[PDB]
Single-chain antibody, 236 residues
Framework: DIVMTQTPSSLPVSLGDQASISCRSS???????????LEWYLQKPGQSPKLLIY???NRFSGVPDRFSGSGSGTDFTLKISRVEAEDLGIYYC?????????FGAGTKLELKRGGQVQLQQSGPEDVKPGASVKISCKAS??????????VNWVKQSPGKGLEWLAH???????RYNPSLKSRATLTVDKSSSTVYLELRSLTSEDSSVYYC??????????????WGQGTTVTVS
């Protein structure tokens, strides 16, 4: 039960303007074993979440030279010295450390006007409430049974922000989210390397778009580097 502070959700800027976001945590996110796992993500309006930063200060590959996780203690922040075209989008701060992980409500970065490895997910599922559904996440480009890597699951309810659900390690140990009331049960087909997530007795609040996410190796300090396309679930 870790609540990540919202921080300046609305962030208008002109181009080339300096940009800085913050993140603050209720309790200490410093994990037993002494590492603090904090990650920063970007979501384009149409796109899937994109990992900007892994383990606070450190940053992901393919990410432009100017970004800084400045995080220290329970206080965290991300700075962009120069803003360009594709840098626009909405940002989330995420902690992968204590118990049930959580995101921030996220920050909207919008222009002020004036003047390989691939993951694949199942199709959309539309079904009456009270029913049960199962979706697929198929991974290619690596071995799911490799040590250090596991598969997470993320749901995005529009306007309700981002939410974490379940995770399955390579050693098959599964942990779910307590708020799910342990309705969900993970499954994995090792032959075709597809990971299944089943949800029992659906309700209206369970209607959302669900994402498949890979916890990276220890080199990435267990961050979500590669994401699914997402699958969309709705109830009647």
């Amino acid at each position: 039960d870790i609540v990540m502070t919202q921080t300046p959700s609305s962030l208008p800027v002109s181009l080339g303007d300096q940009a800085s976001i913050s993140c603050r945590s209720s309790q200490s996110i410093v994990h037993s074993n002494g590492n603090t796992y904090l990650e920063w993500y970007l979501q384009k309006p149409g796109q899937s979440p994109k990992l900007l930063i892994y383990k606070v200060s450190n940053r992901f590959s393919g990410v432009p030279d100017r970004f800084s996780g400045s995080g220290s203690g329970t206080d965290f922040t991300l700075k962009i010295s120069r803003v360009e075209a594709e840098d626009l989008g909405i940002y989330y701060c995420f902690q992968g450390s204590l118990v049930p992980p959580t995101f921030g409500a996220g920050t909207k970065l919008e222009l002020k006007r004036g003047g390989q490895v691939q993951l694949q997910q199942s199709g959309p599922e539309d079904v009456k409430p009270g029913a049960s559904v199962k979706i697929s996440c198929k991974a290619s480009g690596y071995s799911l049974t490799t040590k250090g890597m596991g598969v997470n699951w993320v749901k995005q309810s529009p306007g309700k922000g981002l939410e974490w659900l379940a995770h399955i390690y390579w050693d098959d140990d599964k942990r779910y989210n307590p708020s799910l009331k342990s309705r969900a049960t993970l499954t994995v087909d090792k032959s075709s390397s597809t990971v299944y997530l089943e949800l029992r007795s659906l309700t209206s609040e369970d209607s959302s778009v669900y994402y498949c996410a890979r916890r990276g190796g220890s080199s990435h300090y267990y961050a979500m580097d590669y994401w699914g396309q997402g699958t969309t679930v709705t109830v009647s």
